Amino acid sequence: GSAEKRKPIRVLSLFDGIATGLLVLKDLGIQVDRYIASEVCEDSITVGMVRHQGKIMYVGDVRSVTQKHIQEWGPFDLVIGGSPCNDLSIVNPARKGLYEGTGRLFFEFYRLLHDARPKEGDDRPFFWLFENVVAMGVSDKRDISRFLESNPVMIDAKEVSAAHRARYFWGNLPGMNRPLASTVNDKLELQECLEHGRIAKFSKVRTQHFPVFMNEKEDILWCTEMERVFGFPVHYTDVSNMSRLARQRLLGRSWSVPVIRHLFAPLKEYFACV
Amino acid sequence: EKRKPIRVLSLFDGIATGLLVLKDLGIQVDRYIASEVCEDSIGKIMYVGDVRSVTQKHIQEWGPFDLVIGGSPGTGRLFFEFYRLLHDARPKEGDDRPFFWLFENVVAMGVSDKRDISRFLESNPVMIDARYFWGNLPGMNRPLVSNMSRLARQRLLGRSWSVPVIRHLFAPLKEYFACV
Amino acid sequence: GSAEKRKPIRVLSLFDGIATGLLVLKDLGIQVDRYIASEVCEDSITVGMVRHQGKIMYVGDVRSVTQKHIQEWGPFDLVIGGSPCNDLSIVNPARKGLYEGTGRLFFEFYRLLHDARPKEGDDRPFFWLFENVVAMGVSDKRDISRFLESNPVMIDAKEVSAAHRARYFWGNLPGMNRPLASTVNDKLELQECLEHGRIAKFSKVRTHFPVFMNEKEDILWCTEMERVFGFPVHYTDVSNMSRLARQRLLGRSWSVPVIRHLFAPLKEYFACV
Amino acid sequence: AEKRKPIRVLSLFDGIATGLLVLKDLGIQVDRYIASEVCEDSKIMYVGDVRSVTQKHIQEWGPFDLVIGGSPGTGRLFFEFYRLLHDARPKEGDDRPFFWLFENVVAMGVSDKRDISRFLESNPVMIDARYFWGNLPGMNRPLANMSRLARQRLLGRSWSVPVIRHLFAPLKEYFACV
Ligand SMILES: Nc1ncnc2c1ncn2[C@@H]1O[C@H](CSCC[C@H](N)C(=O)O)[C@@H](O)[C@H]1O
Ligand SMILES: Nc1ncnc2c1ncn2[C@@H]1O[C@H](CSCC[C@H](N)C(=O)O)[C@@H](O)[C@H]1O
């Protein structure tokens, strides 16, 4: 209810990956004051460094971050995160659940988020977002919704991209449950994402079939095609001499860019826009 | 500005243990609410059931709380519930009122779990030969037809296994809360 | 001496690799009527197919190409080629020479070129080019110059790029020996070719660890190597290839500014966009 | 189109004047016989190393009617022979007779055999053993206080048997005979 110049957003991104959040914020025209990211995979760190010109401040393991660190590096306006899910997904029979293995990393989020929320009486806008997979134990989803005091929103990237990617999103971002908008930049069909000389079998691709035909033979998706599918700029992940398995793994763990765009869009009215 | 009876929140295995130690040390109790993990399925003293039913608003209403205890003499599930209850019961920034907590577990745990608990609680444990005891209590600062009323009900029940030597850890509470 | 409308160039590229010739011809604004390429590496074929929208007519092994094929697919205006040099380079001690191993592939060129030369009395412009390495046996170089009836021109890509790549070029292209032009697009220094957050140790790469990133040492990335050799960034980013495959394809490739320098005079002989 | 004239031969075959001897055996008039030989390093003539022979030399000494090469690594020999053949071949539109023959040993890499058959566009003639490629009528094959002292040995041994001569027999139906 007061007057002031809208200021650039301050972001804390845990489990940053290939810095999808910063890319989405840049694409929206939102000015980023600073972007502190916690990531351990060196390949993802190299991707972020090269593609965002070192603007990202890397702090390493999320478990090396203390509350004193959150207050000194802070304040923060937006806290985003997507913890690893190899111990949360039901497709893994050796899953250790939300509380053991790599699932317990989620609590780190719940830790730092509570270390980052404005103290009582601070009416400043503060937003947070936590993404994970839909294919998890109902006990684990109920426990996450208990710890975050919010119910998740289910968004499938197939509605805005060419990939069957349904994900749960907890958070307090404005209008998370609002209908997604299919714009013109959205490549809804897999054929739109393929390189020249290839033909797509299905309309959408899933994370035993090889989806593309090339000449007289069958083939899996290329990394550039996978980038177009997930909404990333072409050759986004073309750094660091990493193996093809490395690029495919990095893109597999990544968020769908149009989905995160849909989620981050309402932030344009709360911060400075270039 | 004057001593008042203690208010406790217990996630420990066995609702009795904490209140028993408190009555042993002779500390007045104005509120004691207990809950269990119950991971399988779903005036002063009260039992509230599954911890999965206890919300932040419940801690607010039942509160304020002065002591928060947890643990047991699957090691990750109960500690994180205890951490959530601690965060929900902590006094807000700017409330210098006393607030203590204690978490007991077995020494036979994964070293990863021990390091994680020490990190999350910002405190190093107390070894008692053997159990680990984390806490902010003074002294726990550590460096690095026509028959019986009873009838069977088909359940196993726990007990209070800790001796008054473990209550010696709680002993400093007598200097912070009213004693009868 | 007569009048006619300039027509698009017809090209025959043997040992095409990654269509360095087609890319150079497109960059120069020269209209390409037809581009028939002979290449056997499937990775290179995929690169050339994807990057040029299937404009390339791939005929496979150069040894499955006959003289009747040159007449029926012809006429051709330009014939370019760069045979493999693993049996020509003095670095390899197990080299088999020009006449054995993979060196004899050169003769295939010498074959098809003579199968594509305009017959006597045909005053039409016809150009050819054959590239290979400088580090070869003096006898093999003398033999190649004897077979092609031309002395080679030595061009080192270090003069217009950031790579110590000196090569021999035989051919009849106009003014091959003319001085090269260092333009503004030329990234002469290895630093200009690096991705963000890396520092170059040497001014030009000779392919130890050429770059320093943060506190560690590292070799050149594929995009950096593309910038070094004059290729557009992410040119070779198709086909789920292994990193070794990308480094191998870029190693065997021509330096783009050098081929541009060689092909530039062709603008006054054919139709230009 | 006109009366027969003597034959003119260009010989790179290992062993000099072997073809001259065979032509003398078959009684064919020879108006020119130029002979050369491949070397490791530096009206009937021997012109030395084939590396010194150019297209202009083939034009001056020419025209040629027969081109012979081979030996009773194999690549260098055949490829020098191919260069000489290409330089001596009549241009398109010249229907004048022009024959060639290339002999090698059967003991060769099968890759080399197929490469020679491809380059010469001809399948070989096996003779109990040597391989003979040629365009002579009959070789068409389907798909399979004394003077001498102190010098580096110059043994001119070369096999010119009647069967080998037989291959050259059709030549007497195209050129003048003494
Ligand atoms: N202990 C830890 N601290 C910080 N990051 C971690 C971590 N353990 C795993 N990670 C990283 O967290 C990532 C989760 S996958 C999510 C990545 C991100 N949401 C994106 O869209 O790119 C993984 O890439 C993994 O490298
Ligand atoms: N027998 C053959 N027929 C056709 N191409 C061949 C071949 N043997 C090898 N090659 C190809 O010839 C290439 C020679 S390296 C030269 C590549 C090209 N000049 C460029 O600039 O990209 C190699 O990539 C190899 O794949």
mmCIF file with all atom_site columns, C-alpha atoms in Angstrom, chain D residues 13-14 69-75 77-78 101-109 112-113 116 124-127 129-133:
data_model
loop_
_atom_site.group_PDB
_atom_site.id
_atom_site.type_symbol
_atom_site.label_atom_id
_atom_site.label_alt_id
_atom_site.label_comp_id
_atom_site.label_asym_id
_atom_site.label_entity_id
_atom_site.label_seq_id
_atom_site.pdbx_PDB_ins_code
_atom_site.Cartn_x
_atom_site.Cartn_y
_atom_site.Cartn_z
_atom_site.occupancy
_atom_site.B_iso_or_equiv
_atom_site.pdbx_formal_charge
_atom_site.auth_seq_id
_atom_site.auth_comp_id
_atom_site.auth_asym_id
_atom_site.auth_atom_id
_atom_site.pdbx_PDB_model_num
ATOM 1  C CA . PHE D 1 13  ? 57.155 -52.942 -67.406 1.00 0.00 ? 13  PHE D CA 1
ATOM 2  C CA . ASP D 1 14  ? 59.786 -54.178 -64.960 1.00 0.00 ? 14  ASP D CA 1
ATOM 3  C CA . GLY D 1 69  ? 53.594 -52.281 -67.513 1.00 0.00 ? 69  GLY D CA 1
ATOM 4  C CA . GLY D 1 70  ? 54.024 -54.535 -64.523 1.00 0.00 ? 70  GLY D CA 1
ATOM 5  C CA . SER D 1 71  ? 56.440 -57.136 -63.166 1.00 0.00 ? 71  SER D CA 1
ATOM 6  C CA . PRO D 1 72  ? 56.666 -60.976 -63.294 1.00 0.00 ? 72  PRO D CA 1
ATOM 7  C CA . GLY D 1 73  ? 54.581 -52.951 -52.546 1.00 0.00 ? 73  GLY D CA 1
ATOM 8  C CA . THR D 1 74  ? 52.826 -53.323 -55.896 1.00 0.00 ? 74  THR D CA 1
ATOM 9  C CA . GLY D 1 75  ? 50.942 -50.018 -55.819 1.00 0.00 ? 75  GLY D CA 1
ATOM 10 C CA . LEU D 1 77  ? 54.236 -49.726 -60.256 1.00 0.00 ? 77  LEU D CA 1
ATOM 11 C CA . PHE D 1 78  ? 50.561 -49.938 -61.223 1.00 0.00 ? 78  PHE D CA 1
ATOM 12 C CA . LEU D 1 101 ? 48.756 -54.612 -70.963 1.00 0.00 ? 101 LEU D CA 1
ATOM 13 C CA . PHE D 1 102 ? 49.690 -54.937 -67.295 1.00 0.00 ? 102 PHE D CA 1
ATOM 14 C CA . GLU D 1 103 ? 51.249 -58.050 -65.758 1.00 0.00 ? 103 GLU D CA 1
ATOM 15 C CA . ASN D 1 104 ? 51.619 -58.798 -62.070 1.00 0.00 ? 104 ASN D CA 1
ATOM 16 C CA . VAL D 1 105 ? 52.012 -61.767 -59.755 1.00 0.00 ? 105 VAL D CA 1
ATOM 17 C CA . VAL D 1 106 ? 48.961 -63.549 -58.374 1.00 0.00 ? 106 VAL D CA 1
ATOM 18 C CA . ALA D 1 107 ? 50.637 -63.311 -54.940 1.00 0.00 ? 107 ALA D CA 1
ATOM 19 C CA . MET D 1 108 ? 49.144 -59.935 -54.052 1.00 0.00 ? 108 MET D CA 1
ATOM 20 C CA . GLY D 1 109 ? 46.663 -58.453 -51.631 1.00 0.00 ? 109 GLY D CA 1
ATOM 21 C CA . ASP D 1 112 ? 45.181 -54.662 -54.678 1.00 0.00 ? 112 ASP D CA 1
ATOM 22 C CA . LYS D 1 113 ? 43.650 -57.078 -57.194 1.00 0.00 ? 113 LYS D CA 1
ATOM 23 C CA . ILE D 1 116 ? 43.538 -52.754 -60.232 1.00 0.00 ? 116 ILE D CA 1
ATOM 24 C CA . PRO D 1 124 ? 42.328 -60.263 -64.976 1.00 0.00 ? 124 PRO D CA 1
ATOM 25 C CA . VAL D 1 125 ? 43.512 -63.239 -66.993 1.00 0.00 ? 125 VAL D CA 1
ATOM 26 C CA . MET D 1 126 ? 45.048 -65.942 -64.799 1.00 0.00 ? 126 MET D CA 1
ATOM 27 C CA . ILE D 1 127 ? 47.973 -67.893 -66.269 1.00 0.00 ? 127 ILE D CA 1
ATOM 28 C CA . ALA D 1 129 ? 51.121 -68.055 -62.085 1.00 0.00 ? 129 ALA D CA 1
ATOM 29 C CA . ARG D 1 130 ? 50.538 -64.450 -63.170 1.00 0.00 ? 130 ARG D CA 1
ATOM 30 C CA . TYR D 1 131 ? 47.692 -61.969 -63.612 1.00 0.00 ? 131 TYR D CA 1
ATOM 31 C CA . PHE D 1 132 ? 47.343 -60.174 -66.961 1.00 0.00 ? 132 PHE D CA 1
ATOM 32 C CA . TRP D 1 133 ? 45.042 -57.194 -67.503 1.00 0.00 ? 133 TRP D CA 1
#
